[PDB]
């Protein structure tokens, strides 16, 4: 039975943070011999083998995410999710010790109240995970009034993709991922990539070409747009994908929502409320590396993209208009 405890002697001591490089001066120039990962150009032979380059493969960079442990009611977080969805943490008031509210993008599609044809695919799917939409709005009675003054985007802190969900009858335990690539639980040695529905995501670099530089970086942005439909306030959340830098995309987003801005500000030639002037906000949900192909999937159908090598780096909400 100590053979089972000897496995924990290997795997814990082998998996630790690398220690501080501290060598006493009386030993001599032995500290130069302790620098192995800074060496980056390895010797190749006529026929190299793994026995020649096992030392080159041993030095790996130190990468680790930081997980978030959320304890959620089982009515908001649907019991079946595709395990890579993006998350948001709504927060209004600390009422109890630990009961937290999480919003998938199909869950925030139902609280919005936007029309069918503007997102024609997920309206079928988010209508079967949830009721009419009042199964969630009973938690936030201020959704008519948070949309008027525009305080809803200041109450979402984007968190990152799912990792694991332990589901019980009344309470679902949800573990997300911040700071980077979350390690997959059930499949070992794997990496959870971030999944967005094909409907919400609006690609931004697209040309005939009819030439743009390659790079290392492409950043997924979130958007959240205050508008009014049927003389009732409602929001709209869309995603963007471009590595163009923040000075362009704010001009690129305004060309996307041109018609939405035109329909609203016709109404305030007659009544001007200063709370109504705030329009939208933009968050930075973290970087994707260059030339990764978003792989199309299908679930029940619901077409869902997936981004491998996603790392999450959350930003604030900046109010564009």
């Amino acid at each position: 039975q100590a053979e089972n405890a000897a496995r924990l002697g290997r795997q814990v001591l082998g998996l630790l943070p690398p220690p501080t490089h501290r060598v006493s001066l009386t030993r001599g120039p032995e500290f130069a011999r302790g620098v192995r990962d800074l060496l980056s150009k390895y010797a190749a032979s006529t026929r190299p083998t793994v026995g020649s380059l096992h030392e080159a493969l041993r030095q790996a960079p130190f990468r680790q995410p930081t997980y978030g442990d959320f304890l959620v009611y089982s009515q908001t977080f649907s019991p079946q999710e595709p395990l890579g969805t993006f998350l948001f943490s709504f927060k209004q008031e600390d009422n109890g010790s630990s009961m937290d509210m999480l919003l998938t993008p199909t869950s925030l599609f139902m609280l919005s109240g936007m029309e069918a044809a503007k997102a024609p695919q997920t309206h079928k799917v988010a209508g079967v995970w949830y009721g009419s939409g009042s199964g969630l709005a009973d938690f936030i009675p201020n959704l008519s009034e948070l949309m008027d003054t525009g305080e809803f985007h200041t109450l979402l802190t984007p968190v990152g993709p799912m990792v694991q969900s332990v589901h019980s009858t009344f309470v679902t335990k949800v573990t997300s991922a911040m700071k980077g690539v979350g390690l997959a639980r059930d499949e070992p040695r794997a990496h959870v990539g971030l999944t967005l529905p094909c409907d919400m995501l609006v690609d931004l670099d697209e040309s005939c070409p009819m030439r743009e530089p390659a790079g290392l970086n492409v950043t997924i942005y979130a958007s959240l747009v205050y508008l009014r439909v049927n003389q009732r306030p409602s929001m709209a959340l869309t995603f963007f994908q471009s590595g163009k830098g923040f000075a362009e995309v704010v001009a690129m987003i305004k060309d996307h929502f041109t018609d939405v801005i035109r329909t609203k500000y016709i109404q305030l030639r007659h009544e001007l409320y200063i709370n109504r002037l705030v329009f939208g906000a933009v968050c930075t949900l973290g970087t994707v590396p260059f030339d990764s192909h978003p792989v199309h999937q299908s679930l029940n159908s619901l077409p869902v993209l997936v981004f491998a090598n996603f790392e999450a780096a959350c930003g604030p909400w900046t109010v564009f208009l």
Partner: protein, 126 residues
């Protein structure tokens, strides 16, 4: 027949297989050692790089290699009688009346979805 005459210039392309002769010991070659560079480290993969460098020096002063056209394989050009549209090269220059300039452009002219005899070839007019 209008007042002038005109000459027409084409091009032509021929896939040709070639015979290259090279005399002996005509270049001195220098071969270095390969190295391995590790970079673009990500979470799904780690990319490597194997590089190698060559010096090549021409040993003698005379020409030591001769290529030749040997065997015609295909004609690609189709030798078509399509003429080049100067409306495409010079889009800025136009007539004074923009009602008459949209008329002559109607009487002359990605539009081709498929071509049968071969790759189409432009002609001029001198």
């Amino acid at each position: 027949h209008p007042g002038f005459a005109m000459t027409v210039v084409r091009t032509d392309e021929v896939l040709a297989e070639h015979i290259l002769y090279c005399s002996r010991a005509s270049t001195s070659m220098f071969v270095g050692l390969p190295s391995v560079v590790r970079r673009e480290v990500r979470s799904d993969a780690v990319t490597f790089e194997i590089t190698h460098e060559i010096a090549s020096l021409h040993t003698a002063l005379g020409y030591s290699s001769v290529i030749a056209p040997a065997h015609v394989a295909a004609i690609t050009t189709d030798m078509g009688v399509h003429c080049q549209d100067l409306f495409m090269i010079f889009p800025g220059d136009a007539y004074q009346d923009r009602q008459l300039h949209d008329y002559i452009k109607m009487k002359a002219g990605e539009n081709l979805p498929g071509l049968s005899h071969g790759q189409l070839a432009t002609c001029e007019i001198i």
